[PDB]
Structures are given as structure tokens and as C-alpha cells.
Design a binder for this molecule. Structure first.
Ligand SMILES: OC[C@@H]1O[C@@H](O[C@@H]2[C@@H](O)[C@H](O[C@@H]3CO[C@H](O)[C@H](O)[C@H]3O)OC[C@H]2O)[C@H](O)[C@H]1O
Ligand code: CL
Ligand code: CL
Ligand code: MG
Length: 350
């Protein structure tokens, strides 16, 4: 059968779904999703600034279509995300003159947003990313407007609110590069200090935006262990593997430059050679060996897309590259990495 049944006894197999896919209108992705995944996450549609215009006004079409889809196919559904510094309008934070509104006023906007959003899907969504990406890459609390107006209380109040709205909801914190030493620890710290405040939190999302070579598997492992120790369920939430030239490690004189589209940084436009098909299978296989090792700690592994043609890495971090990060190709056909992963479970020894 599919991924989901292969991994039934391990964890949920999930896909982020764009709004075209959430519409139901692609029978070929319906057939695929129904076979392969049992968990879905809205890739964009339940984000503050996508869901609401700059005046706080709500359009629920896509948000509603996504919940109709998972109800329809009976898939576990993750809300993404109540409180985040990205894809949210500056009018949330700032007067037209640039100045920041009071904390009190922003609290009120947060109350309303969580109350309406979690409230509306209370009991339909099993899980929420309540706060997304609150630790800076300099390993300090990210200097978002959330943070600058509110402090730790934006995260605190966000969870407490969420939990009051849907008591039943599994409530996560979600971040990227927390596979990595340094930011892993600053996040463990962050949870700890809020958990001693009594903040209701149930899960820790590891985004899992990985590269073909890095981070190493020992890294990821340390993080699975650190976070579960905080008495939380571990999720891999935005899984994909970047197979393109990295701009992450570039010399000074090229901080951008580095985001500009350049030929050589897009080397596989004519197709992914077999030699890299293979590095990608092997890298997915290492990851999933790891995940199986620790499936007492991991509740779910979600991919940040269904197929390559629809991966966000085609445009991040350089617009318009041809990447190959996911299990299904641009023709919806499964890739070498896919069979390696069925095989792990198929041939498993007990
Ligand atoms: O390719 C163009 C564009 O990218 C995609 O939407 C993007 C989302 O996938 C992206 O998701 C975040 C990835 O980082 C973290 O996991 C974070 O938690 C996610 O929200 O968000 C930015 C979007 O531009 C679409 O495929 C398409 O619109
Ligand atoms: Cl979308
Ligand atoms: Cl090639
Ligand atoms: Mg339901």
C-alpha cells in the first residue's frame, strides 16, 4: 500500500497542501494523498495575513476548503499557525506612521484572532502550531514585532489562549534549524522557562527543511531526544531535502549576490541525474532509519509538499530554481527515495 500504512505503527505520514490541492479538484492528488498520507497541514491558508486582509477582515474559502478535504478523506489535520512573524500584515503591529501599538491592544488582536481561528475549527483540527519560529538565528529570541511589543508573553499568551479555545487540541511549538546545536539549546531553554510558567504545550515541531548532506543524522538525533525529554511529543513538520547548491555558507562579499538567480546555482533544470536520485534516496533513508529508531518519541513526519513541481524550495531560497526535495516527482510518480522507505518497513525484522 502507501507510506501511511507502511508507518502505521510508527507515526502519521503527512503532507502540506497548497490551496489548489485542498480544493479537491485534482483527482490524481486525491487518489495519491488518500493512499499515502493520513495527516495534512495547510501550506499557506490559515496564516494570519493570507486568511485576513490588512483591515482584519476574514475570508474563509481556502481555510474552509482545506478542513472539508481532511474531513472528506478522514485525515489528521494540523492548524498552521496562530502566531508567527511571517505572512502577517504590519498593520497588526504598527500604526500607519510606523509606531507600535500598546501591548494591551496587540493582546486584544491576539485574543480575537486565536478565539476566531482555533474556535472555528475546535475539534476538527487535531493539532495547532501555536507559535512558529520564535528563536532568532543568532540564538536569541527573534526580534519580531510580536517579541518587541510583548516579550515572552506573546508565546505564553498564545498557548494559554489556544488551549482555552480547543482544550482537546495538541499544541505545538514549531521551528527550523532546531536540528542544530546552539538553536536547539536556546529553544529547549525557551520551552523550559515557559513550562515553568505553566504554559500549556504538548508537542514540539521540528520543521526538517534539510539539505542533501547537512545537518548530519547525529545532530537531528540529539534534538529528537532533547525535546522529548521536555515531556513533549515530537513531530517532523515541514520535511523536505534541498538538493541544490547552497547559498547558506557563502563568502562575505556575497550575502546577496547570493539570492540572485544564477545559472550554476540551478544545475538540474534538464532533470535530476541518476547519481543524485541516489544521494536523495540514501539521505531520505538515513532520515527515516532515524525516525523509526525514535518513533516512541515522534508522533508524525509531514512533508512540506506532495510533489517536486509544488515545492516551495523551487523559489526559496533563490526564485525559479528546479529543486527535487520530495517523494513524488513533477509527474506524481514516486522517486527512488520512496521505495527505499517502503522497503525499510516492508523488510523490517521482529
Ligand atoms: O514557490 C512559491 C510559493 O512558496 C510556497 O508557499 C510558501 C510556503 O511553503 C512557505 O511555508 C513555510 C516554510 O517554512 C516553514 O516550514 C514555515 O513554517 C512554513 O510556513 O511559506 C511561505 C510561502 O511563500 C507555495 O508553494 C508558493 O506560494
Ligand atoms: Cl497555498
Ligand atoms: Cl546532470
Ligand atoms: Mg473531524
Amino acid at each position: 500500500t502507501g507510506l501511511k500504512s507502511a508507518y502505521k505503527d510508527n507515526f502519521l505520514i503527512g503532507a502540506a497542501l497548497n490551496a489548489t490541492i485542498a480544493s479537491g479538484a485534482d483527482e490524481r492528488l486525491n487518489t495519491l494523498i488518500a493512499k499515502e498520507f493520513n495527516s495534512i497541514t495547510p501550506e499557506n491558508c490559515m496564516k494570519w495575513g493570507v486568511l485576513r486582509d490588512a483591515q482584519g477582515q476574514w475570508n474563509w474559502k481556502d481555510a474552509d476548503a482545506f478542513v472539508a478535504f481532511g474531513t472528506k478523506h478522514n485525515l489528521h489535520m494540523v492548524g498552521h499557525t496562530l502566531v508567527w512573524h511571517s505572512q502577517i500584515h504590519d498593520e497588526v503591529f504598527k500604526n500607519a506612521d510606523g509606531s507600535y501599538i500598546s501591548k494591551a491592544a496587540l493582546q486584544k488582536k491576539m485574543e480575537e484572532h486565536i478565539t476566531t481561528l482555533a474556535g472555528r475549527y475546535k475539534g476538527k483540527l487535531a493539532a495547532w502550531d501555536v507559535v512558529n519560529e520564535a528563536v532568532g538565528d543568532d540564538l536569541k529570541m527573534r526580534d519580531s514585532h510580536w517579541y518587541k511589543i510583548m516579550g515572552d508573553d506573546f508565546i505564553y499568551n498564545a498557548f494559554t489562549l489556544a488551549n482555552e479555545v480547543d482544550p482537546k487540541a495538541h499544541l505545538m511549538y514549531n521551528d527550523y534549524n532546531i536540528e542544530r546545536t546552539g538553536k536547539r539549546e536556546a529553544t529547549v531553554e525557551m520551552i523550559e522557562r515557559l513550562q515553568k510558567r505553566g504554559m500549556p504545550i504538548h508537542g514540539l515541531g521540528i520543521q526538517g527543511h534539510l539539505g542533501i548532506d547537512t545537518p548530519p543524522i547525529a545532530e537531528i538525533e540529539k534534538s529528537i531526544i532533547a525535546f522529548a525529554k521536555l515531556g513533549l511529543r515530537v513531530h517532523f513538520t515541514s520535511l523536505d531535502v534541498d538538493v541544490l547548491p547552497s547559498v547558506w555558507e557563502l563568502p562575505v562579499a556575497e550575502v546577496s549576490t547570493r539570492f540572485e538567480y544564477k545559472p550554476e546555482r540551478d544545475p538540474y533544470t534538464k532533470g535530476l541525474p541518476q547519481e543524485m536520485q541516489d544521494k536523495l534516496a540514501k539521505r531520505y533513508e538515513d532520515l527515516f532509519k532515524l525516525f523509526i529508531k525514535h518513533s516512541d518519541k515522534i508522533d508524525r513526519v509531514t512533508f512540506w509538499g506532495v510533489s517536486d513541481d509544488a515545492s516551495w524550495l523551487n523559489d526559496f531560497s533563490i526564485p525559479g530554481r528546479t529543486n527535487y526535495p520530495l517523494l513524488f516527482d513533477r509527474k506524481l510518480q514516486p522517486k527512488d527515495a520512496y521505495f527505499r522507505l517502503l522497503d525499510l518497513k516492508r523488510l523490517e525484522h521482529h
